[PDB]
Amino acid sequence: WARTELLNVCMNAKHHKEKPGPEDKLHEQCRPWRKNACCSTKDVSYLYRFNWNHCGEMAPACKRHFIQDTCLYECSPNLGPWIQQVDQSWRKERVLNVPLCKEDCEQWWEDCRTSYTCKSNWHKGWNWTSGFNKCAVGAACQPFHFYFPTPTVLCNEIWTHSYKVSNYSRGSGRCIQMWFDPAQGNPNEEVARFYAAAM
């Protein structure tokens, strides 16, 4: 029998698994998840509550990945196998070692080369005085790859091991994609099913 508590599930604030639904208005730009989302019909969304421009303006090509990243985390109903019991430090669920596809990670790392940041663990240590995050005193802004010198360090460390970049590539059926064309189905559904069956 399928471990359905790990499939097509969203972890809610009372730490019960609930079903996804129609995507809410705030997440309209998370297009791939319009029909089936954990961000479904107050908010705690990194679509606007997080300062991407903490070290000057982030390049558009870089920010796009962070939107995809935000969308996956907030909307995906296919992260069940990686959802953890404790998530008190996270705005929604806590996931651990999500097998991000090789390309998603590598392209993310390359597209953010010309951007800047001041720390490698974006999950903690920000100064929230202004209502949004700024680099704390002592945290020097540097080129992106100064804090993330390899795709692995970026994807694995930026959100403290929310991802573990996979050696598998898109289409393998064995890694989670950060974005996709929903008209061609949702590729991460079979990936979730696969890991639920194996773990």
Ligand SMILES: *[C@@H]1O[C@H](CO[C@@H]2O[C@@H](C)[C@@H](O)[C@@H](O)[C@@H]2O)[C@@H](O[C@@H]2O[C@H](CO)[C@@H](O)[C@H](O)[C@H]2NC(C)=O)[C@H](O)[C@H]1NC(C)=O
């Ligand atoms: C966190 O940031 C504040 C400085 O914040 C700025 O001023 C705020 C009032 C607000 O307008 C923010 O948007 C600005 O970015 C630091 O506060 C200073 O704190 C020190 C003592 O540590 C004090 O001597 C200064 O007068 C404060 N300056 C101001 C302008 O209030 C605080 O230190 C920062 N914390 C860390 C660890 O980075």
Ligand SMILES: *[C@@H]1O[C@H](CO)[C@@H](O)[C@H](O)[C@H]1NC(C)=O
């Ligand atoms: C990645 O490594 C795993 C574990 O060794 C292996 O099973 C798989 O074939 C590899 N995937 C590749 C090379 O695309």
Ligand SMILES: [Cl-]
């Ligand atoms: Cl968070």
Ligand SMILES: [K+]
């Ligand atoms: K998904």
